């Protein structure tokens, strides 16, 4: 696997469906951190790991570098130096990551996607796509045909 995409308590089933397919496209593992806000190709499901809670997730990822998507004390995603086996952690669609999780992540590991003057947020699946494909670009798209 190139990267670990981690979704904290995701809300909207279609976004998670899109992210599962995206993870097959960039060669990444998806991690769903329960509780999920909806019910849970078969080859596309061999790339998904469910974790009972955030603590179980941390144990399973112990030793990996965790990047969090947040606008609090973050740089533009393209300014971080990504590496194989990085974890890319995303908050749910309507709330973002809780402060207790954001505070446990150093500011050097916080990333945001730049925005123009517009009040609308990006769809979560598109945000994962932009961040994971920027990270993959930095690794010369290792494993692509």
* Interacting positions 6-45 with a copy of itself (CB under 8 A): 14, 17-18, 20-22, 24-27, 41, 44
Q: Give the shortest CB-79-to-a copy of itself separation in angstroms.
A: 10
Candidates 141, 1, 127; CA nearest to 68 is 127
- Among the residue ranges 31-39, 55-63, 99-107, 133-141, the one whose residues contact a copy of itself (CB under 8 A): 133-141
Is position 139 an interface residue for a copy of itself (rule: CB under 8 A)? no
> Among 45, 56, 83, 144, which residue interacts with a copy of itself (rule: CB under 8 A)?
144
Which burial class, exposed, middle or buried, applies to 18 when counting CB atoms under 10 A from its CB (0-12, 13-18, 19+)? middle
CA 22, distance to chain mean position in Å, is 11
121 annotated ligand binder? yes
Q: Which range binds a copy of itself by CB under 8 A, 3-11, 60-68, 82-90, 126-134?
A: 126-134
Output the CA–CA distances (angstroms, integers) from residue 79 to 13, 30, 36, 108, 111, in the order listed: 31, 23, 31, 10, 9
Gap between the Cα atoms of 22 and 129, Å rounded: 7
Nearer to a copy of itself, 78 or 109 (CB): 78
């Amino acid at each position: 696997k190139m990267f670990h995409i981690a979704l904290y308590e995701p809300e909207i089933a279609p976004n998670t469906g899109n992210i599962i397919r995206l993870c097959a496209n960039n060669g990444s593992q998806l991690h769903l951190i329960e509780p999920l806000g909806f019910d849970f190709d078969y080859a596309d499901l061999t790339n998904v790991t469910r974790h009972k809670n955030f603590d179980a997730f941390l144990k399973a990822m112990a030793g990996k570098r965790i990047m969090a998507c947040t606008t609090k004390g973050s740089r533009p995603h393209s300014e971080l130096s990504f590496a194989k086996d990085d974890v890319l952690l995303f908050g749910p669609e309507t709330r973002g990551l809780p402060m207790s999780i954001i505070e446990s992540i150093p500011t050097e590991q916080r990333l945001r996607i730049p925005m123009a003057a517009t009040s609308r947020s990006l769809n979560l699946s598109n945000a994962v796509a932009i961040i994971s494909y920027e990270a993959w670009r930095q690794l010369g798209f290792e494993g692509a045909i």
